[PDB]
Write a protein that binds this DNA or RNA. Sequence first.
DNA 1: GTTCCAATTGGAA
DNA 2: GTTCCAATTGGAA
Lengths: 109, 108
Amino acid sequence: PMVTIGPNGTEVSRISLSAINWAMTGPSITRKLLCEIFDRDTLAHHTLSGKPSPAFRDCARPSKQQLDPLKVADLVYLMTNSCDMTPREVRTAITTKCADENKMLRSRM
Amino acid sequence: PMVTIGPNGTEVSRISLSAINWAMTGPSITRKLLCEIFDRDTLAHHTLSGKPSPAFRDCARPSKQQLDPLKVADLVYLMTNSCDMTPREVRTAITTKCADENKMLRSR
DNA sequence: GTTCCAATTGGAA
DNA sequence: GTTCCAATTGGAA
């Protein structure tokens, strides 16, 4: 039914796990899991660290609550053991997914 | 004298090559070769693509040129055949060095 | 429809 | 004295 990703006990189903083509790039697979671990609006209103951008402290932008550190830690643990990538690659794939989810939400308006 | 880097025909200091510790990270070594291939004033005025930032298209920033594509292509060629890092990593290390060298000038 | 590019920034590392 | 982290952008791929 469901499978724990990492030591923290965060889990997704085997159905969506088996519905993934592992022939594509790591970051893309990471984005596929984020829509399976988190929801759409959560990714759109959260960031990787919960910090504001240093390049916008003048004009500012909506402060976003930090994503779950425990859930992300398992994802980083997965990709580094399965696809054998670096945590830097994963955390960059994550921080660019939340940003793209923020774009798309604005596209409905 | 000086040693070529890639097929596009760009060379670097033969001494400086020997003075590089390859035990370091990919991006690190890449940031050491850039200062030996490009002048510091060039890095502080040039970028990877030459394009401006999409987040600052209305906020007009001073124009910064593009680094020599042939010189960059050889740099990317070296790291992939030696340290076996990805072209992604190399191009990201370059766009930071050019951004960091600009921070040096801004402080001065 | 989604991802990639890479430029910009300040403090932290 | 340098590098790293990652947030944010709009068009390009």
